[PDB]
Amino acid sequence: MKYAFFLGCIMPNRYAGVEAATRTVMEKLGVELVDMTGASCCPAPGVFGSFDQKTWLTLAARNLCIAEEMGVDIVTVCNGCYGSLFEAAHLLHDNKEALNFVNEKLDKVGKEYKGNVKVRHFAELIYNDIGVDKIAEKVERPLNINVGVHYGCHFLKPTDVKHLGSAERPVMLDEIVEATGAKSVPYADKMMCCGAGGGVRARELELSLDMTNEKIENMIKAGADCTVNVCPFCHLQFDRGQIEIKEKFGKEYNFPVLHLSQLLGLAMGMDPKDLALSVHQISVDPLLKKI
Amino acid sequence: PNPEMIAEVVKALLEGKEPELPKKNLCEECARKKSEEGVAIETIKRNYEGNPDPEKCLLEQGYICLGIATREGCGAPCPSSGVPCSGCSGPTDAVVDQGAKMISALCSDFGIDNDRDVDPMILPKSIKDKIGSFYKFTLPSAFVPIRLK
Amino acid sequence: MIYSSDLNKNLASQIIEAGTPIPGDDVVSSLKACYQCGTCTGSCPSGRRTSYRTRKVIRKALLGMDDVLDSDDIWKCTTCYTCYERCPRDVKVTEIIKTIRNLAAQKGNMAKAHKMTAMYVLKYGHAVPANKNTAELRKSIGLSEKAPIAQFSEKDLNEMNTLIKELGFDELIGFDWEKGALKE
Amino acid sequence: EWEPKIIGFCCNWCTYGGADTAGVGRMQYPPSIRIIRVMCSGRIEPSLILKAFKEGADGVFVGGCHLGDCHYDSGNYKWQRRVMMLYELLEELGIEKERLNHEWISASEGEKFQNTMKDFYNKIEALGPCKLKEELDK
Amino acid sequence: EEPRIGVYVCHCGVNIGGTVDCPDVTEFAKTLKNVVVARDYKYMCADPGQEMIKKDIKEHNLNRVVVAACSPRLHEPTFRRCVAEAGLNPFLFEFANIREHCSWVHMHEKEKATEKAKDLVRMAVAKARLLEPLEFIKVGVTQRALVIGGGVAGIQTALDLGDMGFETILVEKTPSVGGRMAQLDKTFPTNDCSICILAPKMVDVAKHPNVKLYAYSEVVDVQGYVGNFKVKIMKKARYIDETKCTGCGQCSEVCPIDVPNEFDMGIGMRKAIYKPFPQAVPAKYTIDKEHCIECGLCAKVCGPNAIDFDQEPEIIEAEVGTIICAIGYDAFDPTVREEYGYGVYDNVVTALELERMINASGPTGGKVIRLSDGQKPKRIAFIQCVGSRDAKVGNKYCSNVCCMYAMKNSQLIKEKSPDTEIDIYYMDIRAFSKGYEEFYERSAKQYGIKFMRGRPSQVIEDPETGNLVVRAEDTLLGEILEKEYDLVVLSVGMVPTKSADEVQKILGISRTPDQFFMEAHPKLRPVDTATDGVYLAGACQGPKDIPASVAQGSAAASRAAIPLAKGEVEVEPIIASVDAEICGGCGVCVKQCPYGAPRLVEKDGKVVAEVISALCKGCGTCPAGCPSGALEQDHFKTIQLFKQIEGMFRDTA
Amino acid sequence: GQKPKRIAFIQCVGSRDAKVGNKYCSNVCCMYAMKNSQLIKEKSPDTEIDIYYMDIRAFSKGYEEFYERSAKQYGIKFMRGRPSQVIEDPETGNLVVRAEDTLLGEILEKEYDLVVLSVGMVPTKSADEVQKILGISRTPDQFFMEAHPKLRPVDTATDGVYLAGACQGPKDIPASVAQGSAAASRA
Amino acid sequence: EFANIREHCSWVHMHEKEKATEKAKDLVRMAVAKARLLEPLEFIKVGVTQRALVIGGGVAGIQTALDLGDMGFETILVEKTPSVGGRMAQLDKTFPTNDCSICILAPKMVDVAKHPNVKLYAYSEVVDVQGYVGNFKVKIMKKARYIDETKCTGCGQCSEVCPIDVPNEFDMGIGMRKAIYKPFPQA
């Protein structure tokens, strides 16, 4: 398996530890990860989909062309990029006037999208193509902790195009994190939004923190030692949001937050140092003690 | 055309009577036995495959035989001699495109015993030369008598 | 009170036309299938802590109340897609709200922080560009000191500015090219 | 200056009713096609398709009931087997497979019939005229 | 004889004339060979238009008529009778459709629409020249009817036919007639018991002198056509000689095994030796082998000696002239709507389960209880439109009865327990027939039932208490409600019955988009099908209540009695026949016909195909498949279709 | 005599209304109001059409689809709110309809060029004469009384006298036809 | 003997169970009282006249006559107005198919006028009904059109010479008709 590795923005430029975690974990499961040289913002659907839909799709198609000229499919570790690139690929697959509109724009930069790129989420790639048994085979250090799994919204939905099964009661991320030896705990309103998407974190911050605080509370009451996500936007909201929540509302939880690449990293015997856990706004060390 | 048929046509015109050709398709004259339950074709065979049974209709055995879409008159020597009819006498008076009708018949009865489940792409994929199978002697008189280039 | 003169009979058709061909005529015209059941509002997490009622946004559009475009409420949708999943009338609510935001944005109703995010992508190719903490961190972690991203590739950054100008996106956010800053 | 000439064969029960439904619903589509009524799609055979191309057809459309919904139980299954052979026969003759289009359209599916006519028109318009009629006329 | 054709272009007011230049089409039609008279008129189907055609037929000695107007699916019978009145054979008339297929879909392309109409007229004339005069085939009608399904609808059809004096067979799949009405406690809007109205009908049907009831039986084969159906009924084995059976029920007491009772929707549990419900007709018991253990225990307590394990299913063969399909419906399975938690939460139930709970003769003795606590719920929520008006489950239709039965069972719960609070979550209240709106006013004013306008988004179970919380917006307040309930009832909608696919395959009838059976015309033939001699009655034709199902049963008996009373009908002659002088018996056609019409025969020493005219429905598949052209379908000959294709491009000259 | 560009439909006029003595539902007005709204749109796409309703009752086969079609395909508007009054502008002849948009909690006052009252069904003028001649009863809705709504939906308690159609109660064409045939069987 | 303790007791005294029970006892005793003096009576067999009467020539009455006629029963169809067709003849289209209303109904109107077993009395009214089931004796007043059905064309060249304008009831009074008239063209 050879996949063009779309990086996005937050993971490469802020939470680089997730990138390090991903590069080794997926090499270890046996995926060659190619670089998309010159790939930009996907672009973030919340702001760019909200300002101009044509600009979102045109800039998204441009990143797809990078992979199509490479003769390779994209995999991403972020729901944000996954949603943006997947939905762009599908609409360009399905709507031929939208495809015409985009290539007349990309024609001015010597590009043309032809419909060959498939976009894959790394969690879904692991489940459907690699197998959850292959993660258990490589667990060097079992992680015997209770995990509050946060699927994020743009992973499973819209189900009518994602075709990743149920969005109401999914099992895909729970079985993945349970292959590391951890226990995914049920909690109230498990599938609810973290609050950050759709530009809401930037424009209505306290609204976003209200939803994040609800999620954290339900995880803690179900005995979660940390939360795990499949999106740097979720990561930032759970991690940085706890600082903001504390400064604005006055609650402190010090609830550790991990991206799935980091959690898999720990299972496969990676050095916490190369996971860049120190850059987390909330200390992971209470978690490191239990594992 | 067989020699007697040439004789009947000409002598009729010498006498002043109109000549009239035979009108049925070939299975009439052919001595091979059919199924009274009707023609059903499970697979399609090229004429070199297997061992054709001397008495059973070749079309029911799976060989593209043009007797069904070909006018009688010759005596059916090819099926009598162990090979399918190639259709050289041409269609009956009620068929214009001999190859089109043979294709219609062949497709209708292919997998007819399993009508709703037989894959409709088995038959085109098993025939590598279609124009040559169905238009040997009549292509210039077919509705499409050329290949466009 | 609400009179005819305060209503815009064609608002729904604007939203539809703004959504053609992206994300699609059939996608956004699903707005006209809504029968005001309120399943979306019951599913909305933003509605559980604000005055935001998803169903009312759809309603105000169908009736022609332009103040939707000026409202703060359309911007409280997180695009979780839950209403989309459950709507019994196949209303593509999440795409309808984003299209409405386009018309809101071209009317000047864009948050400053959102304009910034758009400026960073136009200038550096990325909503979150790399700083020098990014370099020193990526060093210690074992990664390429600079990510292989458009930010460090003038050709790809040329391509985006070319495309951006063609789309009029720079004029939408009011970005000035030589001053290299946004106009308020 | 040039408009596609399209010929249609629609079953009386489902597809002909779908074309009526589009007319009742004022569902506009290009005026290239002319529809010939038959009781069943099983009435359609290769010779009818080939005859239309001979006459000058740039595209040929056939519409019948959904598979299983045939008013005569299984007429469409015979037609489906014939049309798959006809697709590849048309290629051996240098006629683009895309010039032939068969669809399953029920009487209620006026909208589907409308877009089928639109998609087929654009496909045939982009292919240009079929050059068979002008080769035989040399 | 040389064709003499009259061509008539219709304006249809401006429906055609507004887009198609009819005078120009008319002028063009006179350029085609054999067109003797051509004219445009504003309403051709109007009496002045028909009188114009018939009068030209005589004055101009026409042998063909072309009418370019609307669809033959509307006026083909109209114009066929018009020409027949003038002495012209009805099959020398050809319909060109220039409205539905031209003027109405090309309104913005008038020039091209006019040119299209011209080609559609020429294609019509082209086939018209080669049409032949045909004669309708008369057939006898067997004086007997068959009803499939013994609910209210089918029972009503059998009693009406039987009362008219026609022998009638009534086939019931389950051991008892009665259908889903038998499962209901009361019925809106009178609030009678279902037994009040149904049970006397069940009694009358069982002892009617002209009705043979085959309970625990199913139709397994139907062949033939109107007036001449040969049907095979598999009368399943009960393993109890019914003639000797008393129905006392002593045997059920001794049975040592338990079985999920389907009549109670999986709530109540029965024995393998059982009778569906205490008022079942026939009042006979049945042994289900799927669980029978054969210890003889049942036979020991039975006086008559009716029990008998050696029983084998018997196949009955019967001639009938007409068939009425009345196989009812099933409740929607709301498991797929995951947000509501049916099949997951104990205290989420369907409405049809509630009927079995609230019914006096029910497994709970008429007591509404929580299936987790066993306690009586003091707060109840009704959720409307479950499985209806919902594109996510592929059911975009209204199930018609769920608004009324929810208010009905709310009244009944309030009567048994006035302290109960009942909330109905709805989108529209559809109380649309006589007394319904008043029933709706009464539910709120008199019984204090509460109505929330808001389709719930999800049901949240309290795992600890089994209580349920219903999240929904009060749309009439603009606020989100999260009320707690001891029991949630899902007003599931109607869907076709499981065996509908089997019945459809046997009778050869169509279905509407909602998957119910398709009537011949949505306005003027609500109980006819497009298959002659086959009719519909009840909920299998579409979601409807009892009064509508009963009226349809009586309507289907009137329609199905017309062929029986006439004793003869006519079948269309658009049929296939063999030209013996062209057929050399290739055998291609035989297997193509799903009715077995073409047959290989031996006349004059040779083998030749032969079509049994009575078995041909006129599909035209096997003429299209005949490689010799001996096989042709009248009115759709290959040569006729060939001319029609040429007419698109040139006059057939 | 000009063509009206803005048209308002008012539902439940003379039905579901205790003030006029008609507490029943007339059964067809929801569907015929959407119907003629479609037929007006077809003859004039730019016509604005609002339907002021309380419940949309599209209850039979194809009716709910017809209701969805009216809104999605024909762009017909639905206001949930029974109008309180109509006010004519004596200058122009136009009409203002006043109603609460109950799904917003705000009072609407939109202007229209033509207002259509979706009037309900009442017994026919001669129903009194016929009733005395046949000797049959009437239900609370003033239509003729069947023997029993479910046991005998087209019989009367007068032996040998039967009912069919809207004289027995408000209903559409397929319902009247079915009763026509039902009454033929019973008679 | 029948005692009514439901409609007359249990359903109207739900809040007074003790008195409803006492009342039911009295109603049983009043029934038993009459029961003691009831006498064996013989049902009276009467022949049934092999003919039907349908009052009203709309889609519902037309359907009943055609069904009865097609069964082989003589049937009389009495229509009060000049023409059959009912309100369906006034509709433009019919939901949910939007079929032309008159265009689908007119073949039924044609069929009923031509039917061998149906006698159509248009512009007529039933003025008296006597007898019982199977033995009705009815009077039909064929009202005078003052035009000879046999000697009149139906062309309508006498309206122009009429000074009286009358509310055209077929058009609900929106257009005026002459004293001499035909209701609608497809009549």
Ligand SMILES: Cc1cc2nc3c(=O)[nH]c(=O)nc-3n(C[C@H](O)[C@H](O)[C@H](O)COP(=O)(O)OP(=O)(O)OC[C@H]3O[C@@H](n4cnc5c(N)ncnc54)[C@H](O)[C@@H]3O)c2cc1C
């Ligand atoms: C919860 C609920 C409450 C309701 N309440 C009311 C109410 O209060 N009032 C009211 O008027 N209506 C009510 N209805 C609607 C009512 O149930 C239907 O109108 C009525 O049952 C329809 O009768 P039917 O004979 O057409 O179909 P069914 O009642 O379903 O009867 C069909 C019969 O056909 C038989 N059958 C099925 N398949 C076959 C086969 N293959 N071969 C032979 N026989 C077969 C079945 O055994 C069954 O006996 C309610 C429906 C539901 C779900």
Ligand SMILES: Cc1cc2nc3c(=O)[nH]c(=O)nc-3n(C[C@H](O)[C@H](O)[C@H](O)COP(=O)(O)OP(=O)(O)OC[C@H]3O[C@@H](n4cnc5c(N)ncnc54)[C@H](O)[C@@H]3O)c2cc1C
């Ligand atoms: C505005 C409107 C729109 C509608 N649209 C639709 C629609 O789109 N689709 C649909 O299905 N339904 C529709 N309906 C309902 C439809 O009109 C009725 O269902 C239908 O007319 C019922 O036919 P009927 O024969 O029962 O009654 P009618 O149509 O009224 O016919 C009764 C007949 O009896 C005659 N008559 C009356 N009194 C006497 C007497 N004393 N003696 C002799 N004859 C008499 C009358 O002249 C009339 O000819 C609509 C109704 C209205 C008001």
Ligand code: SF4
């Ligand atoms: S062999 Fe060729 S010819 Fe002889 S029968 Fe079988 S088919 Fe007809």
Ligand code: SF4
């Ligand atoms: S081939 Fe020519 S000859 Fe040999 S059989 Fe077929 S036809 Fe008679």
Ligand code: SF4
């Ligand atoms: S759900 Fe679909 S329909 Fe019910 S409201 Fe929200 S949108 Fe309009």
Ligand code: SF4
């Ligand atoms: S999507 Fe935007 S709207 Fe639909 S629910 Fe989630 S938030 Fe409320």
Ligand code: SF4
């Ligand atoms: S004929 Fe068909 S079209 Fe010509 S008028 Fe009567 S209906 Fe309108």
Ligand code: SF4
């Ligand atoms: S016992 Fe023998 S008889 Fe008494 S019931 Fe059970 S079966 Fe019928």
Ligand code: SF4
């Ligand atoms: S035998 Fe079969 S049935 Fe008779 S009892 Fe033992 S089990 Fe119940």
Ligand code: SF4
């Ligand atoms: S009936 Fe009342 S409930 Fe059953 S569907 Fe139509 S509306 Fe929803």
Ligand code: SF4
């Ligand atoms: S197919 Fe044409 S030819 Fe062969 S038998 Fe049946 S009919 Fe005679």
Ligand code: SF4
């Ligand atoms: S036509 Fe359709 S039906 Fe009549 S015979 Fe040939 S096949 Fe059997």
Ligand code: SF4
């Ligand atoms: S139908 Fe629609 S309108 Fe006519 S009454 Fe019942 S509700 Fe009011």
Ligand code: SF4
């Ligand atoms: S005038 Fe009136 S009456 Fe004298 S004829 Fe012409 S129509 Fe018949």
Ligand SMILES: O=S(=O)(O)CCS
């Ligand atoms: O929707 S956004 O693109 O703003 C981030 C959600 S992952």
Ligand code: FES
């Ligand atoms: S009748 Fe339509 S496909 Fe057979």
